[PDB]
Amino acid sequence: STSIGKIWLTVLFIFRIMILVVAAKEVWGDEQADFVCNTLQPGCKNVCYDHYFPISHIRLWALQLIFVSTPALLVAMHVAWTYTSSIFFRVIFEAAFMYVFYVMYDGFSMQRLVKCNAWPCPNTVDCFVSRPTEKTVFTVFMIAVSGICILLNVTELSYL
Amino acid sequence: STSIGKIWLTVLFIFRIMILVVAAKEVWGDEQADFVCNTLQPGCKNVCYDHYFPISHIRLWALQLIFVSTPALLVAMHVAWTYTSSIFFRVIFEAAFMYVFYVMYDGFSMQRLVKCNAWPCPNTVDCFVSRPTEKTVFTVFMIAVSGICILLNVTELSYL
Amino acid sequence: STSIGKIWLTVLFIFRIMILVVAAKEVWGDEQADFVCNTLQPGCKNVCYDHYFPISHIRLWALQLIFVSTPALLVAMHVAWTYTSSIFFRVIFEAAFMYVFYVMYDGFSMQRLVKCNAWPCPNTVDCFVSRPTEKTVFTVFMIAVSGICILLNVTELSYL
Amino acid sequence: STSIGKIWLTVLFIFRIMILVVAAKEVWGDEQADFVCNTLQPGCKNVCYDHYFPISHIRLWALQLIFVSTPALLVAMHVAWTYTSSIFFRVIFEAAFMYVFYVMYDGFSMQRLVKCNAWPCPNTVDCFVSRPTEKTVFTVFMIAVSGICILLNVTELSYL
Amino acid sequence: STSIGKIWLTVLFIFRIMILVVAAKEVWGDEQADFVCNTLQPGCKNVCYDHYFPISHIRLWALQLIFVSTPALLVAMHVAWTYTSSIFFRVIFEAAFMYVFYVMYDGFSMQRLVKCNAWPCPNTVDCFVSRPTEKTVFTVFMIAVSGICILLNVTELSYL
Amino acid sequence: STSIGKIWLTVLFIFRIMILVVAAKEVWGDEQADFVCNTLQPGCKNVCYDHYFPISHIRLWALQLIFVSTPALLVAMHVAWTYTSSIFFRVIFEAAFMYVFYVMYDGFSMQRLVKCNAWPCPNTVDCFVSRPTEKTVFTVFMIAVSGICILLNVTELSYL
Amino acid sequence: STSIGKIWLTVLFIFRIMILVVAAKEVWGDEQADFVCNTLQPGCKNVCYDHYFPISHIRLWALQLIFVSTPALLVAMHVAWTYTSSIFFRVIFEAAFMYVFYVMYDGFSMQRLVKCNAWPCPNTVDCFVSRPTEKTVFTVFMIAVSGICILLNVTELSYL
Amino acid sequence: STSIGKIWLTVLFIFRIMILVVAAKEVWGDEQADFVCNTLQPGCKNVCYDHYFPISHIRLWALQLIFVSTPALLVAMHVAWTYTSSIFFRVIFEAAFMYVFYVMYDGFSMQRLVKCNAWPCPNTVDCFVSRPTEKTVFTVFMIAVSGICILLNVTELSYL
Amino acid sequence: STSIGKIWLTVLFIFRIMILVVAAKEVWGDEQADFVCNTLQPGCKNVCYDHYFPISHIRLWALQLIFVSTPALLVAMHVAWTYTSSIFFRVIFEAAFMYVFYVMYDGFSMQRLVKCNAWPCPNTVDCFVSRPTEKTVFTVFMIAVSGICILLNVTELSYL
Amino acid sequence: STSIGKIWLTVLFIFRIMILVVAAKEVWGDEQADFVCNTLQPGCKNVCYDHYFPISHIRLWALQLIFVSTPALLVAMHVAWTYTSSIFFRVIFEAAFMYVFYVMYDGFSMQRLVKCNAWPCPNTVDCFVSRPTEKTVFTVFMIAVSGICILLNVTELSYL
Amino acid sequence: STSIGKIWLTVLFIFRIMILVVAAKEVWGDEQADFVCNTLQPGCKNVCYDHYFPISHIRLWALQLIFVSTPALLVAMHVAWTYTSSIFFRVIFEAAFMYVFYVMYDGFSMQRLVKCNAWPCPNTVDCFVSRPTEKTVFTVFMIAVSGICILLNVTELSYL
Amino acid sequence: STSIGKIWLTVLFIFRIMILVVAAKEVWGDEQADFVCNTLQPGCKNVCYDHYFPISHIRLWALQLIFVSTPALLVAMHVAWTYTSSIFFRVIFEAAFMYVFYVMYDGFSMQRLVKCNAWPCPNTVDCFVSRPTEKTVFTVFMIAVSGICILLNVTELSYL
Fold this sequence. Notes:
By secondary structure, chain A is mainly alpha-helical. The first copy, chain A, is built from 5 helices and 2 strands; from the N terminus they run ααααββα. Chains G and K meet through loops of G and loops of K.
């Protein structure tokens, strides 16, 4: 009396991907040319972007979809329990990509402004960003659904 | 003696999507680089765009298509009434994405001009926009069809 | 002894679409960045473009293809006369999108130059356009074929 | 003892299209932003381009492919001689699109330079062009193959 | 019982000149490079300046000082009545340079803005000016003192 | 037992002039090209400068020197009391040019920043100024010495 | 005891194409906007590019793939020896597109710099290029594989 | 008791490709226009980019995927041991593309800054780069998985 | 009964010079930086200015003042008729500098616009000028007074 | 047995003035347009210049020359001890203008660089200066000679 | 029976100087900022100007006036023949400054265009000049008068 | 039997000054705005100019004229040997200003190019200069005459 979750996991799998692809190369596609810095110093743009955007939300999402898609195809051609090792792996990767945002970004809510004091740059500067609100709104979805996929995966891994 | 509506809902489903995709990455695709502001202040462009375009019409449409597409695929693989819970959900989401425009945007008719008085910006400014007429015209379609999908969904949910 | 027209309507349907897609995002794809205005005033470009291009020929074509494609798919899944209501609808929409050009544009022949006296703009100005000849040539095709689809639809609706 | 030509016509049909699509949106895709004019006058670029490029080679090719593709699909669903009317039509359209180049362009060899004396422009000017050699080379192919398709179509229309 | 005026005329002579030279090459010295026109059209600046500043107030003042200084030096070395012919000449020249302002300029009060519709320029434009208030204030002095020099010259020419 | 003041008046006369000429065309000589306004709107610079600098301190000083120099030369060639009418005139002009600053400028201390909401300008703007501190410091001298010249002129006009 | 080569020819056919498409519109896609010339003269860029890049390596490759693909599809529908005429044609075209590089380009190794002395250009100039190393590296592959396809085609045409 | 590896090799094959294509034309797609050099010298950008980016990581990856994909399709149509020659080839190519990075790039960790002293360039300069962190992170994946594919290929080639 | 003219000649001598010096380095002082040409071609400005302004009115005036001043100082220290040789020289030089304007300039009235077709310049161009009206007005004075000095010099040379 | 100093004071008076006037409007004459600030923020230049250059060395020198010249002319026309009051005044003013530099400037040695954190400016910035070495060298002279004039004035005021 | 020449030498002395000073800082005063070079290379302007204008005509004139003025003042205070040593010196210096033009400049007639191939500059370039005609015309005067001063100095040195 | 030198010293005194003033504010007057540096780094211009032009030749000349003029006026009012102390001072100052050039500048011959590696600047750069030849030529005069004034001063100080 379970495995409603298998549905919801396929549902939210296709969800995540549709949610991704539509806004995917549509939102952050301009996330280099809209990163003003109130200076004239060359390169400080690139430096500060590197400091405060090692990676975009969308890439880390992408890999999260992969490593969470891997147990599906891994377990598909697994013969021709040995079933829940996959499922536990699927938990821990998901939880990983969750934790890494809670580290790298200041807890999801992107700032309209940041500051930057790296090398080529003279001192503190004031580098703006595009659409911080927007992307944050998308994050709320991805992270919510992530928590759902976890929680159900947890519940249905709890079957002896 | 009903379920003509099922047709019209598939019809308008494919409609919405065709209507979307054609103008989709074709109209708002330039909705960052055509957002002049009559200043020289850096970043005020991005700030004001964020203030008056949290999200574009097209994204919120996109999600509206998803959450209204979800009861279709949800109910498809629902066994292998428990039929109209889906339908009611399909109502309330639709009505939601309707209401949220009537809030966030000043009632569909986008202005050729706006003003903006946020922080980095000195005072009131005058930031223009591209093609406000055009997009508004597309909104009239999306919102009209939304109202249709609602109204029929309402009528055919009224079957005991 | 009729219904040669059904062929010609499918023929010209596929025609319109091929004619569209090839020049589609290929011709007007630059119809924002090639709209010079002999001033220095900011935004007057966008304003005047909005005044004299509410919508491009290509969008209105696109919708015309949709609402003329709708009776095909509407009538396809119409059971599982009640046949010519569709056909009459197909007439009136076509005629509509015809009339609306004869209004909005100064009778198809686009001008190399226009003038503009809207608000942000100081006075009369002189805003040029790209490739007015070209697009006009495409219009002659779309409008011609439109008239054909009408005329045949009229003739074959004249069967008691 | 004929109809080797039917092969060669399909061969060269697929040829023309492959030849087109590869260089299609790859060569003239920059044929607006590389049309320097040695002035400072606004708009004179657009004016002179309009005067000396009503339409590109690639569009007229495209339509030529259509109206030469039409007898194929026209004659396919022609029942469910009345065969060579199509073929003659296929001749005359081909010959048309040939003649129109020999008019509109100064006999295929595009000039590195042209001159222009239209209205907004003060006097004679000197507007350059991109890659005139290149496109001309492609023309030699399209026009050659056009002549082949004609010549064979002529020979095999000569069967009583 | 007269010829207090001779004093006042020398007084106001030295006055005019001091008033001139101090603001002379100090005020209108920038009266070419501060004549913005809200266009991008070349030369329209020079054209419109020529149309609405044939000559500056300061030049016409300068000549007025000369032709009013000439009777002084003319009459000085006049022997080695034949005295009031000079004086009458001194009246009429003064009155001349007065009248010519009341013609050429719109009655002293210079406008912050003007318009211009000459040849090279497309249409009406909006060309600003520097410091219209300021120069007008100086005019009030020059014109006032001019009227004084006249009025006294008139009174003391009224001696039989 | 007086007329020490005659000395001090010549002293401060030569003073004012030396003080003037040294900083004269040396300080405000750049008081047009250093009047930034944080916009892109043409002309708003000139408009706002006109609104908040009808005349510079230095011009009004200059005239004040003239009209206070006039009683010296007026009274010099006054014969070939009738002495203190001049002196009283010298008071009232001085006091005039004092009062007019206390009106036109916001009480001597020039602001680093001002605002401006005139016509061509969209809204409130933020136009900076050069060296407000500096010029203010010079004003303290001119105004101080003005008060001295008054006060002594008052005391020595108080001789029956 | 042969026709291992048929495999290798299909292998290298798919190879060439994969090798092409990946770097295809990815490498030379910027081969107009990265063609600096150390001047200010207009158009000299386009002129010199035309002189030293009539056609890119990638186009001539593309056609080489076509005319070498033609004997495959030509010989496929050749009935419903007369087999090796195709094969010899396949040799000579391949060898042609080889020879034409050895002419038009200075023997594959593209120079970081070139010079140019055409008409609009004043004299010798110094026009740089993007990524000459890179593209050359790709050429080594295409040309190598070309030589392989030849050599095997030669060997297996040597079967009586 | 082996050939679990065949799975993992298909798994990581599809992995590499998904990992590639998503970030493929998405990350280095701007790896020409974001290569600032703190000079004004023309071309020095292109020169230095050529010196320190002969080829991008992504191209060499691409070819590595090809030459490692070739034994799959080579061995597929190999009949209609002679099995492990392919496998050994698959080892050595992989190891090659590994070694070549350890040469050409300074051991994976890309520098935010580099220097450059080539010809057109005057002296040492300071040319920045975009997103060095990011791409390096992707390298860690590609190189890791490369090592895995090697190591398993090694282990399963060790079967007598 | 003559030699009123000697006065008028000194009068107009001092006149010419005062008239000169005031407007001298005040009017044509900007007669290089206000010589727009509606192109982008380098140098064409200088070329066309050279073609249509070999020398300014003011220089040729200057020399005319010299060579007409020379007989004054020549004849002053001429001993320690032999008087009218000087006077005749003074005629012919004056008449010379008159004639040379009637040649070099198109009869005094300077054009707001000219054209130019010299070498570096591509074709006919349209080079504007500053203040053509103004300078022409000054010419009317210089040329008038020149004619006066001639005419009187003629009359008083007519004394046996 | 004294009043060698009277000589040295006239000597150094003429000295100071010659030293001034030569470098006077020759050195700091560009001390507005050479005050770079490594930003793009408008006005921050003017603000920071105001903060770190209230007044230039040259102005304060100028006034110091005046108020030290005043006892000369004051004492000249002092009758038609009452001699050393002047001299003491001459001490204290000199010492004043000395002290005020030791306050306002960081002890004469001007820095090549400064920083600035005023209002319109975002944060700390880095505003350079022209020729700090040079002007400092001139200061060493002015300040040295100032100390001399003091010291001698002190010694010769020490005469009972 | 000689020493008419002494007059002519004073005459032409004052001549040269008047001729100089009027056009002096009036003609070549812009002979740095009007020295276009059709490149973008920095500094090549300065280099080429240095190569083809070591010194201007006006400086060498100036020194020529000095060293030819020196025998006047040298011989004035020469006591409190020993007269013609001066005169011969006056010859040879004059002849020197003549010869040096005939060397350094290509025989007086300045070219509208020159070329330049110095170091920082890539190759031959095309650097224009301002007003070559004009200055040449002035040279004709200076050189003519130089020849006169020589010739008379020669004749009057021929007195035993 | 001496004191010919007194003449030559006055001669060369007036010489130096004439030589100075003519080229004085005429040559180095542009010696800030013509100091290109082949970078984009802000301020590096000012830094490098400061490093390689602490002071111009003309200033140090100026002071040299002063301190060599001081013994003239010092010795003039020296009473109302004690004569040669002045003369020796006049030697040593002259020799000083000579030595200081031989230090600060690389032995008179200014380089067309220099290099610079100061702080704000990234590395070695290449900063050009204006008219190095020219100024060097003037130096040859000033330094020559300096040596003359020394040598004669030495000889005539050698009188017991």
